[PDB]
Design a protein around this ligand. Structure first.
Ligand SMILES: Cc1n[nH]c(C)c1CCCOc1cc(C(=O)O)ccc1F
Ligand SMILES: Cc1n[nH]c(C)c1CCCOc1cc(C(=O)O)ccc1F
Lengths: 115, 115, 116, 116
C-alpha cells in the first residue's frame, strides 16, 4: 500500500524478476531491524510489503539482492547488493515508489512519492 | 498498446505531469515524420500513442519537451529536449515502455520490453 | 577544453573506448549542420572537438553513436544513439563536459559547465 | 589512485563540492569497520583515501553523504546517503573510481576499474 519497489534490468531491457528485496527499519540503538521482504514479480514489482498502520515515520533501508540476480543470469556483477536508505515523512505525499535500474557495474534509483 | 512513455522528475520525486511528448518515424529519405503525440498524465504516463497495426518495424524518435516542463516550474534547464531514438523489432517482445528520469542538467532513460 | 565528452560502460566497469561522437549545430534555416566529430580514447574521453573561437552561441546536438559502439562489441542494443541537445555560450563562453554512461538498453547523461 | 570518488550535481550542472564520504570495510565479525573518509574537492573529486598496501581484499562500503550535502545547500532531499558496496582486490590489486550523480530524489553510481 504505502511502499512499492520496482526493479528494472538495463542489460536486457526488462523487468528484473525474482529479485530478493529486504526492508529494514532503523531502531533507536542505530541497528537495522528487519521490517518486510519479498521477491519481485514478473513485472519487476514488489507489492504488499507493508500497511499504512505499520509504516510509521523513520529511517528505512531497502536492500536489493543484485548479486544473486546477476549470477542467476550468468553475469559477474560489481556490487554485493544495492541499497536505498531514506526517511519516511508524514508531511509529504502518502505513497512511496522506490525504483531501481540495474547494470552490472552501475545502478540508478529514484523515489516517486504521490498522493 | 505497443508503446508507452513514462516520465519522472528527480528534483521533486514525482511523476512529470503535462509534459509534451512527440513520436516520429524515420522515413525512407531519412527525415523524421510525425507519428503520434500527447501530454503525460497525472501519473507521468502517456498511453494510447499507437496501435499494433500502425507500429511497424523501423526507427522511431521520442522527443520529450523537457525545457517547457522545467520552465513551468520556474527552473532553468540545460537541454532543449530529451530524445530517445530506437529501432522497433518484431523478433523481440511486443510491448515497449520508454521511461525517462529528468533533472535540470541530466536525464536517464531505459527501455522495458515485455510480452 | 571548450567541449569535452566522456563515455563510460556500465556492463564492463570501464571507459567506453572508441565511441564515435558527432556534434551538430542548428543553422539559421533550422537544419542541423555538422560541427565537429571524433572518437573516445582509451580513457573514454574525447578532447579537441572545437576551439573557443569556433564554439559560438548556438543550439548544439552531441550525438553519441552508442549502437555502433555496442555492435562493434558484438552486442545488439536498443538505442540508435544517445543525444544531448542544448543551447551553449548564450551568457558568454563556458566550458562544457558532456558525460554519458551506457548499457545495452539504457543510458544516462549529465553536463558539467564551468566558467573560465 | 587505488580508490577515488567523484561526485556530480545534476541540478546545478557542476561538480558536487564538499561532499563527505565515509568508507567502511567488513570485519571478520561481520561488522562495518571505519576504513577511510574525506570530502570532495572543488572538482568533485576525492583522492588520497587509501594506499595499495592498506587497500587489501575485502568487502567495502563507500557511503556518500548526500543528505548532508543537500541540507548544506538548504535543500530537503529524499535519501540519507548513497551507498556503493562491493568486493575489492579479490583478483589482485585494482584501481577503482566510484562516480555518483546526485539529484534531490535520485542518484546514479558507476564504477570504473583498471588494472595497473
Ligand atoms: C529512467 C530511469 N533511470 N533510472 C531510473 C531509476 C529510472 C526510472 C525507471 C522506472 O521507474 C519507475 C517506473 C514506474 C512504473 O513503471 O510505473 C513507477 C515509478 C518509477 F520510479
Ligand atoms: C554516475 C553517473 N551516472 N550517469 C552519469 C552520466 C554519471 C557520471 C559520469 C562520470 O563519472 C565518471 C567521471 C570520471 C571523470 O570525470 O574523470 C571518471 C569516472 C567516472 F565514472
Amino acid at each position: 500500500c504505502p511502499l512499492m519497489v520496482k526493479v528494472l534490468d538495463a542489460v536486457r531491457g526488462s523487468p528484473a524478476i525474482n529479485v530478493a528485496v529486504h526492508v529494514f527499519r532503523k531502531a533507536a540503538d542505530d541497528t537495522w531491524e528487519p521490517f518486510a521482504s519479498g521477491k519481485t514479480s514478473e513485472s519487476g514489482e514488489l507489492h504488499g510489503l507493508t500497511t499504512e498502520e505499520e509504516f510509521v515515520e523513520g529511517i528505512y533501508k531497502v536492500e536489493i539482492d543484485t548479486k544473486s540476480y546477476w549470477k542467476a543470469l550468468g553475469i559477474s556483477p560489481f556490487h554485493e547488493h544495492a541499497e536505498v536508505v531514506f526517511t519516511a515523512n508524514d508531511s509529504g505525499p502518502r505513497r512511496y515508489t522506490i525504483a531501481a535500474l540495474l547494470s552490472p557495474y552501475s545502478y540508478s534509483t529514484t523515489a516517486v512519492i504521490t498522493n
